[PDB]
Amino acid sequence: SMNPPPPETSNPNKPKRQTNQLQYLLRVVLKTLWKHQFAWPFQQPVDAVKLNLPDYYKIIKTPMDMGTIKKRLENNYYWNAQECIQDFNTMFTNCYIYNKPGDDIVLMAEALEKLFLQKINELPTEE
Numbered sequence: 001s002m003n004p005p006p007p008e009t010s011n012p013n014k015p016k017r018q019t020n021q022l023q024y025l026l027r028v029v030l031k032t033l034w035k036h037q038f039a040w041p042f043q044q045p046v047d048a049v050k051l052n053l054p055d056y057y058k059i060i061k062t063p064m065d066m067g068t069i070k071k072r073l074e075n076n077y078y079w080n081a082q083e084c085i086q087d088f089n090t091m092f093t094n095c096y097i098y099n100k101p102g103d104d105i106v107l108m109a110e111a112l113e114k115l116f117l118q119k120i121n122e123l124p125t126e127e
């Protein structure tokens with residue numbers, strides 16, 4: 001019982017939108033990171049039960065992962081690119097806060113973040 005509900009990926013009361021920046025975030029940015037060799041620990045919510053991390057959700061109150069982001073993009077959950085970018089940043093930050101510098105998972109997150117920033121640097125202008 002000790003995992004919280006995952007972050008919502010749909011909401012009938014949240015306005016939905018399709019922009020070329022959000023299309024780019026799904027088709028280029030997420031795609032790039034999703035299939036990367038270090039992606040797998042970030043492809044779903046942290047299962048603190050299975051991973052035996054009892055203190056995870058005592059420390060991390062704003063969980064986020066790429067599985068959630070991918071679904072949010074696919075479901076047109078975001079109104080703009082900044083909402084999505086914020087979620088990626090939350091994911092990386094959680095990893096850096098909970099784990100110690102130099103830990104393998106931190107190195108993995110840093111590699112993904114470097115790639116993320118490279119791709120966001122080339123975010124296209126709005127149509």
Ligand SMILES: COc1nc2c(cc1-c1c(C)noc1C)ncc1[nH]c(=O)n(-c3ccccc3OC(F)(F)F)c12
Nearest residue numbers: 040041042045046047051053094095098099104105108
């Ligand atoms: C260590 O952080 C995470 N590990 C996850 C994991 C999530 C994390 C994680 C993240 C991301 N941010 O904080 C933590 C903790 N999800 C699944 C999974 N399966 C698995 O065997 N592992 C795993 C377990 C122990 C040591 C390393 C592990 O993965 C790693 F090599 F990639 F680092 C994980």
